[PDB]
């Protein structure tokens, strides 16, 4: 829906351009500034909703514990769950961040500045990131003592 | 509605003058002879009326559309070029007698 709105807006801008009006680029720049501010606000709302979901559709990440040669092992490891969570949050970010810019390089092609356009500053990002070592930390904690049971094999009869 | 003194643009042409011409344009055939000065003035006003009415309608339309533009400040930046060319044309015209 965001891409469609941007496409229609850019089509209207191009229609204005072909009519050969006056002073287009500065108007385009101000419109882009406003739309990026609105995008930053919407991204803040979505990111905070995603965070409170962690604490927005989220995929369910799952990993198991098994044993081989009488050793407890993880499949995939906890750091792998960490990386999956970071990848999913990144995808949620580029849902809005991958939106193309409006124009008459990589940064100029599509808008990547909303993080600096954040109405509440990096805090809204940070808290999101923060929830990460909520979850994973408890995870490894909950694993640790449980994993401790493997020591029983290290100690022969 | 505004404390400042608005310098509204008008046209140096009374709309009523043509009426006088019409009076002459009616009284000439009625049998009444009017002074030659009145005849010349009425004829000149009659022949020059279309230009004056065109100017006054044009300036009124321009004032209406420009106040409409300034009603929405988001567009004056784009319309500045057309406003500049219209102002230049007005500046050229005003110096004329």
């Amino acid at each position: 829906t965001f891409s469609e709105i941007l496409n229609r807006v850019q089509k209207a801008v191009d229609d204005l351009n072909l009519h050969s009006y006056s002073n287009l680029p500065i108007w385009v720049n101000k419109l882009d500034m406003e739309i990026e501010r609105i995008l930053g606000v919407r991204l803040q709302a979505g990111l905070r909703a995603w965070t409170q979901v962690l604490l927005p559709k989220i995929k369910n990440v799952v990993h198991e514990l098994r044993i081989t040669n009488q050793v407890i092992y993880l499949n995939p490891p906890i750091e792998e769950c960490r990386y999956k969570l970071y990848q999913e949050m990144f995808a949620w970010k580029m849902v809005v961040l991958s939106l193309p810019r409006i124009q008459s390089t990589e940064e100029e092609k599509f808008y990547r500045n909303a993080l600096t356009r954040m109405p509440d500053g990096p805090v809204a990002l940070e808290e999101s990131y923060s929830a990460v070592m909520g979850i994973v930390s408890e995870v490894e904690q909950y694993v640790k003592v449980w994993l401790q049971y493997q020591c029983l094999w290290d100690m022969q009869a | 509605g505004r404390t400042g003194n608005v310098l509204k643009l008008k046209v140096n042409f009374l709309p009523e003058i043509i009426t006088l011409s019409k009076e002459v344009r009616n009284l000439k055939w009625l049998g009444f002879r009017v002074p030659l000065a009145i005849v010349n003035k009425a004829h000149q006003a009659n022949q020059l009326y279309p230009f004056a009415i065109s100017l006054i309608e044009s300036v009124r339309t321009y004032e209406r559309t420009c106040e409409k533009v300034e009603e929405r400040n988001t567009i004056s930046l784009l319309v500045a070029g057309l406003k500049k060319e219209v102002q230049a044309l007005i500046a050229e015209g005003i110096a004329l007698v």
Binding site: N23, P25, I26 | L7, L9, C66, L77, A80, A91, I94
Partner: peptide
């Protein structure tokens, strides 16, 4: 050397132009 757009088209508020032309008509 990426060139940037120069000074944009100005507004020149109608009041200023009107008063300047008042002056010009006054001295003519």
């Amino acid at each position: 050397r990426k060139l940037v757009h120069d000074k944009e088209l100005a507004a020149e508020d109608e009041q200023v132009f009107l008063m300047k032309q008042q002056s010009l008509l006054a001295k003519q």
